[PDB]
Amino acid sequence: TLLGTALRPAATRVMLLGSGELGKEVAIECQRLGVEVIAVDRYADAPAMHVAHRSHVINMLDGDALRRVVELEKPHYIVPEIEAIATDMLIQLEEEGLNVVPCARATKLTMNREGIRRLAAEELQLPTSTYRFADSESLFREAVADIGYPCIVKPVMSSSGKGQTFIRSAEQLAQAWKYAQQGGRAGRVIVEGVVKFDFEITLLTVSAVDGVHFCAPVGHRQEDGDYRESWQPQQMSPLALERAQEIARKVVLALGGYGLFGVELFVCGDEVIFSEVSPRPHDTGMVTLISQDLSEFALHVRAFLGLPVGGIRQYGPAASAVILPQLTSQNVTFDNVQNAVGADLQIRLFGKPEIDGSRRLGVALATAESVVDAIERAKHAAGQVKVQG
Amino acid sequence: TLLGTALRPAATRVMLLGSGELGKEVAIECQRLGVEVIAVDRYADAPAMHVAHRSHVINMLDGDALRRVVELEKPHYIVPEIEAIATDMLIQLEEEGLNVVPCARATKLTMNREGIRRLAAEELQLPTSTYRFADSESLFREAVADIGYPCIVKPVMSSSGKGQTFIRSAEQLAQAWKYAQQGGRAGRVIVEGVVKFDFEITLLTVSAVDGVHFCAPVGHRQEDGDYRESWQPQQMSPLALERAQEIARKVVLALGGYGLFGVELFVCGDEVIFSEVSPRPHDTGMVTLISQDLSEFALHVRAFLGLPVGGIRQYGPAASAVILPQLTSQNVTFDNVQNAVGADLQIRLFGKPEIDGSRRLGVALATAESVVDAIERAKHAAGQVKVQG
Ligand SMILES: Nc1ncnc2c1ncn2[C@@H]1O[C@H](COP(=O)(O)OP(=O)(O)NP(=O)(O)O)[C@@H](O)[C@H]1O
Ligand SMILES: Nc1ncnc2c1ncn2[C@@H]1O[C@H](COP(=O)(O)OP(=O)(O)NP(=O)(O)O)[C@@H](O)[C@H]1O
Ligand SMILES: [Cl-]
Ligand SMILES: [Mg+2]
Ligand SMILES: [Mg+2]
Ligand SMILES: [Mg+2]
Ligand SMILES: [Mg+2]
Ligand SMILES: [Mg+2]
Ligand code: NA
Ligand code: NA
């Protein structure tokens, strides 16, 4: 592995497709290695743009626009932060010699639930919830009848809970369908049977030159489409951890390429069920910004540059808690910060230029002698922040 | 403490006067809290500029220049990275209501050996080496005479050992007095009595809203005016430590203002001698990038922003080892990096645009079961990096 100096002729150039808070940490980690960084998104002054050498604002879903910026900047690596990208062009570029992280195919499979679900369940034969796809309201109903109640419906091209309904009875059928129609490319939906798990985790898995590595299990708490808190490690039986790792290894290798992946699993005692996977750093993994020697972001960077991971140090019980206000402003301020940080307590404020309703503007991080204590410390701190605008 | 959003009208602005590797990490820490960063230096593309919002290239020794950049950017904080600044303008500006970190007084006193030496030895009655100020070769001559052999001669406005001579014999004196002229402003010096210590430390001391806190002592190895290796924690007697803390506290409290200070001391048995102090993060402190929950850069920011520190966690035996090549190039590359990273091992590459002689281009960071093992690990990794021109 050879790295050049950012801004010099032999520079190593990384292009970030999506410049949110997740990309922001990847940028920092690239910059820490003197890696040249070009941050791209659909809006100006996005978080990652704050710490990049240069930035561009384009239609990331536009394959031509993508090709244009790529031709213009000639990055060595293209690093997507989101699902909503012209994956078809990524494939082209990849063939054209571009390094798409982790790989263009991983990106295509995961931008639509259909690709990923069918691969895991049908091709890989991994355990998953029952599911049915539907592209019409009527077919939607047939699916539900076959799946049974309760069931959850989701748009095939969605994230963060957009257009999702937890269906308990036929009564909600109408609304569920509409709502789901509202979410996406505005068509197709997935109808999944409800898994009743003891708890859920995100197994941060790194595929690198020196193999597949696993971070300690991350537990999380969801609240209406968004993670609210995450913690590590999440206690699990030895058998469950082994099955979890088996599943994650298979999925990442199947998706292919080097990088860190966010493997979402449901745990039922000693049993593990595959949910979905981020072929990149996971929002819940932000706890790793305090709980490990190498964050999930440092890890992704390390893996994709072709460097060996060697190993990951976990410092003990930790948690994250989102700072998720609800307001409309283009000049957000954060007061009472003196009460949100301290011993074994930190915060991150993303620099997002504006908000119009609910938006994750930062995160509180804490360590403690138990996850229970960390979670409370972290929730408390996030809550202390006075968001005004 | 109220923080705005970077790039927004109510943004909180930090101006960095000096954009090297140290400033680079402070910039990252400011960015992590959504603070707006303006990186200033005397050459373009300085490391901190890579991660700043914007930058300026000026002659930091020119007060008018300084005033102009400050007035232009209207920063809420002015943070120096180095001694070589128009501290007089700093004083003025502070008087005008600018916030100079830690305080303008602290900057002035430390940029001149004469101020700090006299303050510590005389004002605070602390243990230091034997010293004397010459202001004529003749006086230089008389002074070396009063101090004896061997002795150290230093410009009173010198760093990185610039313009210093280690004198064991009279013969050197022609040379010695001239060199004390090579470096500095280009004509006053200090003559210090050589201290025969067991080891040298840097006591990273944070002065914040919740008072003064200390990092575990950092030992280090200097060679040719440059630190080579640093490690933590340096083994010391409880008595020794206590005395070191005592000295650090009096000094930081005496200079004033919030921030991280690098207190250089010498240890002989249970005795501690004050050498000097940096009113900002110290190079040797780079080990804190792997050794603590909060790096010296995060500490500096936490403190200057008026937030509480609470506590500092140390993660066991840790070390830093510089990447200090010597060649002339404007397009440096780094090969064999895969052999410089691994478990408990990381490296940083600063992004410096060029080199022409000996220059610090990166640092290796390691953790181990023992300080000794950590040092080997760090040294070995720095040595594996092949620096090409
Ligand atoms: N079949 C299922 N059974 C039980 N709970 C489920 C099921 N599918 C989803 N959930 C729950 O709903 C949450 C969100 O589901 P998910 O499939 O990840 O939506 P998403 O829109 O893809 N969100 P994101 O993680 O941001 O990509 C999960 O994390 C679980 O808490
Ligand atoms: N009186 C002394 N006795 C013994 N060693 C000394 C003495 N003064 C300096 N040294 C050694 O010389 C090194 C550099 O001295 P120093 O006074 O810190 O110079 P400088 O130019 O100000 N360097 P810097 O640390 O970058 O500001 C110290 O770190 C010690 O290892
Ligand atoms: Cl189906
Ligand atoms: Mg998803
Ligand atoms: Mg999510
Ligand atoms: Mg999910
Ligand atoms: Mg000095
Ligand atoms: Mg010194
Ligand atoms: Na920048
Ligand atoms: Na790839």
From Swiss-Prot, chains A, B:
Domain of life: Bacteria
Residues binding ATP: R113, K154, S159, S160, G161, K162, G163, Q164, E192, G193, V194, V195, E200
Domain ATP-grasp intervals: 118-305
Residues that hold N(1)-(5-phospho-beta-D-ribosyl)glycinamide according to the record: E21, L22, E81, D283, K352, R359, R360
N6-acetyllysine found at: K178
GO BP field: 'de novo' IMP biosynthetic process
Binding positions (Mg(2+)): E264, E276
Gene knockout outcome: Mutant defective in both purN and purT requires an exogenous purine source for growth.
Enzyme class per UniProt: ligase
UniProt keyword list: Acetylation, ATP-binding, Ligase, Magnesium, Metal-binding, Nucleotide-binding, Purine biosynthesis
One GO cellular component, as annotated: cytosol
PROSITE patterns per UniProt: ATP_GRASP
NCBIfam families hit by this protein: PRK09288.1, purT
Subunit structure: Homodimer.
HAMAP family registered for this protein in UniProt: PurT (MF_01643)
Task performed by this protein: Involved in the de novo purine biosynthesis. Catalyzes the transfer of formate to 5-phospho-ribosyl-glycinamide (GAR), producing 5-phospho-ribosyl-N-formylglycinamide (FGAR). Formate is provided by PurU via hydrolysis of 10-formyl-tetrahydrofolate. PurT is also able to cleave acetyl phosphate and carbamoyl phosphate to produce ATP with acetate and carbamate, respectively.
Name under which the protein is recorded: Formate-dependent phosphoribosylglycinamide formyltransferase
Gene that produces this protein: purT
